[PDB]
Design an enzyme around this catalytic site. Structure first.
Site, short mmCIF file in Angstrom:
data_model
loop_
_atom_site.label_atom_id
_atom_site.label_comp_id
_atom_site.label_asym_id
_atom_site.label_seq_id
_atom_site.Cartn_x
_atom_site.Cartn_y
_atom_site.Cartn_z
N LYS B 44 45.82 22.51 9.04
CA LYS B 44 45.41 21.12 8.87
C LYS B 44 44.65 20.72 10.11
O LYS B 44 45.08 21.02 11.23
CB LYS B 44 46.65 20.27 8.78
CG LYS B 44 46.39 18.81 8.84
CD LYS B 44 45.63 18.18 7.62
CE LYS B 44 45.11 16.77 7.79
NZ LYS B 44 44.24 16.25 6.68
N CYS B 131 35.87 12.45 10.89
CA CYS B 131 37.07 11.73 11.32
C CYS B 131 37.11 10.35 10.73
O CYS B 131 36.13 9.87 10.21
CB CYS B 131 37.26 11.71 12.84
SG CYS B 131 36.05 10.77 13.76
C1 LIG Z 1 44.28 16.38 0.57
C2 LIG Z 1 43.04 16.85 1.36
C3 LIG Z 1 43.09 16.89 2.75
C4 LIG Z 1 42.02 17.36 3.46
N1 LIG Z 1 42.09 17.35 4.83
C5 LIG Z 1 41.11 17.99 5.54
C6 LIG Z 1 41.18 18.32 6.91
O1 LIG Z 1 42.28 18.07 7.53
N2 LIG Z 1 40.24 18.94 7.52
C7 LIG Z 1 39.07 19.26 6.84
O2 LIG Z 1 38.20 19.92 7.45
N3 LIG Z 1 38.92 19.00 5.54
C8 LIG Z 1 39.89 18.41 4.86
N4 LIG Z 1 39.76 18.22 3.50
C9 LIG Z 1 38.52 18.62 2.87
C10 LIG Z 1 38.67 20.01 2.25
O3 LIG Z 1 38.87 20.98 3.30
C11 LIG Z 1 37.43 20.41 1.45
O4 LIG Z 1 36.32 20.44 2.39
C12 LIG Z 1 37.09 19.48 0.30
O5 LIG Z 1 38.29 19.02 -0.38
C13 LIG Z 1 36.15 20.07 -0.75
O6 LIG Z 1 36.65 21.29 -1.26
P1 LIG Z 1 37.23 21.25 -2.79
O7 LIG Z 1 36.13 20.83 -3.70
O8 LIG Z 1 37.70 22.62 -3.01
O9 LIG Z 1 38.38 20.24 -2.79
C14 LIG Z 1 40.85 17.75 2.77
C15 LIG Z 1 40.84 17.68 1.40
C16 LIG Z 1 41.89 17.24 0.66
C17 LIG Z 1 41.83 17.19 -0.83
C1 LIG Z 2 40.66 8.67 6.07
O1 LIG Z 2 40.91 9.72 7.03
C2 LIG Z 2 39.83 10.50 7.37
C3 LIG Z 2 40.11 11.72 7.98
C4 LIG Z 2 39.15 12.65 8.40
C5 LIG Z 2 39.39 13.94 8.97
C6 LIG Z 2 40.42 14.75 8.16
C7 LIG Z 2 40.01 14.86 6.70
C8 LIG Z 2 40.65 14.21 5.71
C9 LIG Z 2 41.85 13.35 5.82
O2 LIG Z 2 42.80 13.70 6.59
O3 LIG Z 2 41.76 12.25 5.20
N1 LIG Z 2 40.18 14.30 4.36
C10 LIG Z 2 39.05 15.01 4.08
O4 LIG Z 2 38.67 15.10 2.87
N2 LIG Z 2 38.41 15.65 5.07
C11 LIG Z 2 38.83 15.60 6.39
O5 LIG Z 2 38.12 16.20 7.22
C12 LIG Z 2 37.86 12.23 8.03
C13 LIG Z 2 37.55 11.03 7.48
O6 LIG Z 2 36.19 10.84 7.18
C14 LIG Z 2 35.91 9.60 6.80
C15 LIG Z 2 38.51 10.15 7.07
#
Ligand SMILES: Cc1cc2nc3c(=O)[nH]c(=O)nc-3n(C[C@H](O)[C@H](O)[C@H](O)COP(=O)(O)O)c2cc1C
Ligand SMILES: COc1cc(CCc2c(C(=O)O)[nH]c(=O)[nH]c2=O)cc(OC)c1
Ligand SMILES: Cc1cc2nc3c(=O)[nH]c(=O)nc-3n(C[C@H](O)[C@H](O)[C@H](O)COP(=O)(O)O)c2cc1C
Ligand SMILES: COc1cc(CCc2c(C(=O)O)[nH]c(=O)[nH]c2=O)cc(OC)c1
Lengths: 313, 313
Positions: B44, B131
């Site tokens: 994460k 972020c």
């Molecule tokens: C519940 C959730 C949490 C995520 N948290 C992060 C994160 O901590 N860091 C990040 O780089 N991307 C985060 N993402 C983005 C995913 O890594 C990914 O880039 C995005 O969901 C698109 O891929 P998908 O179409 O397979 O869902 C998160 C996505 C989801 C659904």
């Molecule tokens: C609402 O919280 C966030 C958090 C982040 C960084 C972590 C992250 C999150 C998350 O922790 O919400 N979700 C994503 O889909 N991609 C992410 O990279 C980006 C962000 O971009 C707007 C909003």
């Protein structure tokens, strides 16, 4: 129960209309849209000179939506101005004319000549800002200083209420900045959210190939892919531009999808990809489906729920 | 026939891994991903201190994909560094650690501590440029001078090959500017395309409500909605960054969707929404499906088709 709206000093039987570019390029197309049950129609975004557009294949559709790199094929401003001035039957529905000049000066030239026809016949201008400026620069609505210039110059040249077609934005700073720019221009009375989602890439697994020819397969996305992005932009601009109307476009295939747009804030609801695929019969279906959802919910008019999307706590 | 590959001085059993944020927050989650058939795992995104993240509900999924406003909930960098240094079994698969500090200084502080663990254990850094939004400020990857600062500072502080997780872009000028920024930094050895599509809005028609609580329902989109966007970003960076690897993320639900990512240029293929919905069993299915498509086509290696998407004429 009814779908009627009164906006921009016009009456609309229902909120539905084509999205610019779909079923709206030729006289035949415009006559088709006029004969349909839509509440309005918009013409193809035009340029001063006719354009053939990009090489084919340049549009493709799939279960979840469409991709296009049309290249602004159009019959030229003079044709769409003649349609507005001499051919359209205003007793059937309102007409919007969309313009997409390749420079600010080209847009100014067109709007100067549209003005008198707008004033006399009531054609409504939609200025497409989700289009090319200088190659290697972002599109106009992703270049806030260009955007401001275009809106200042068009506002001076046209002098009448108009609207703008916006690409989708993805960052809250951009929603804030874009809306602040639009709110500088009191003649911008409507904002249409959204144009296609830019520069997507569809690849066919069997042939291992892109599906459209121009731009190495890259093109704007429409349809089911874009509905949550469309709704976000509609609601973001609805919240930030309280003195303007918002028209929704993106992802409408059903009366349910239209109802969502309207809950987000949409006045008019435009239909692109699904109209391209289904044809103009779609408008009776969408009207029936929206009226069924309204009946089940007890809503008698659109204003009872427009912009009334609920947030959680 | 097997899917094993070598990248970044590491061996991988197959190109699949979780997307950062999905099944990777706690020790339990990381052990589950390690026990899976994935080729690698990523943690994460972390901050220096633990965060609780946003109020619930903050994730929802639907047939076409997901929306989230998690708020960067995480156990803090010390935890993830301890997992990398003492708990991860490197004999099972490679580990990536994702970092998302809220300022450049925070990222610098974290990377200086990760560097020796990278040298000793071979943990790999993925630097997340996204972020939580700050009013008045665009996301870092959408502010090219900020991006350049972050990467300069991280490159200096870390000193070792790393990767960067990018949000999607939608304009060809932006692809050109972003890739030129990335190509200024030789230690950036991989680029992950893409993070979720920012600031979508999902609305429930029955309840007339948004479906997540934070940020008036606005959140990042994943899943089927974003596959063409993802593919476009993978291919645009694959073409522009010949000395880097591209990792694909977005919309992978099947070995066919993986195949498309690889054709576009992906070296590793990350799975977010579909993993969240199906669970870690998805990795055996994706591997079987991708081997089947390869066998039907006569491909014996990933290298035979990576980046080999065909254009028309
Ligand atoms: C519940 C959730 C949490 C995520 N948290 C992060 C994160 O901590 N860091 C990040 O780089 N991307 C985060 N993402 C983005 C995913 O890594 C990914 O880039 C995005 O969901 C698109 O891929 P998908 O179409 O397979 O869902 C998160 C996505 C989801 C659904
Ligand atoms: C609402 O919280 C966030 C958090 C982040 C960084 C972590 C992250 C999150 C998350 O922790 O919400 N979700 C994503 O889909 N991609 C992410 O990279 C980006 C962000 O971009 C707007 C909003
Ligand atoms: C073939 C085609 C041509 C288009 N040409 C134009 C155009 O000339 N002007 C414009 O503002 N938008 C144009 N668009 C964008 C549509 O108006 C609409 O904003 C977009 O397709 C999203 O709506 P949808 O999801 O209903 O397709 C075009 C779209 C398609 C599919
Ligand atoms: C490949 O040709 C174009 C054409 C335009 C303006 C017309 C247009 C087109 C089109 O004519 O291709 N397609 C859209 O989805 N929306 C539009 O607004 C914008 C554009 O990118 C900003 C590229």
């Amino acid at each position: 129960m009814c779908l009627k709206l009164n906006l921009l000093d016009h009456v609309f039987a229902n909120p539905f209309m084509n999205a610019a570019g779909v079923l709206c390029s030729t006289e035949e197309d415009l006559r088709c849209m006029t004969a349909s049950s839509s509440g309005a129609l918009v013409s193809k975004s035009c340029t001063s000179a006719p354009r053939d557009g990009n090489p084919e294949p340049r549009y493709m559709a799939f279960p979840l939506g469409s991709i296009n790199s049309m290249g602004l094929p159009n019959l030229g401003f003079d044709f769409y101005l003649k349609y507005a001035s001499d051919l359209h039957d205003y007793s059937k529905k309102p007409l919007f004319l969309s313009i997409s000049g390749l420079s600010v000066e080209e847009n100014v030239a067109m709007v100067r000549r549209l003005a008198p026809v707008a004033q006399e016949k009531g054609v409504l201008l939609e200025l497409n800002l989700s289009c090319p400026n200088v190659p290697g620069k972002p599109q106009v609505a992703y270049d806030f200083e260009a955007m401001r210039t275009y809106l200042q110059q068009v506002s001076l040249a046209y002098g009448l209420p108009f609207g703008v077609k916006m690409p989708p934005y993805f960052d809250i700073a951009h929603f804030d900045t874009a809306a602040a720019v639009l709110n500088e221009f009191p003649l911008v009375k409507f904002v249409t959210c959204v144009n296609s989602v830019g520069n997507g890439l569809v690849i066919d697994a069997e042939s291992e190939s892109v599906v459209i020819k121009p731009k190495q397969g890259f093109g704007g996305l429409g349809g089911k892919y874009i509905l949550p992005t469309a709704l976000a932009n509609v609601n973001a601009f609805y919240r930030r531009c309280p003195d303007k109307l918002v028209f929704g476009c993106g992802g409408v295939y059903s009366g349910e999808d239209a109802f969502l747009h309207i809950l987000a804030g949409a006045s008019m609801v435009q239909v692109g990809t699904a109209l391209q695929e289904e044809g103009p019969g779609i408008f009776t279906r969408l009207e029936d489906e929206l009226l069924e959802i309204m009946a089940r919910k007890g809503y008698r008019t659109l204003e009872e729920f427009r912009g009334r999307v609920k947030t959680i706590e």
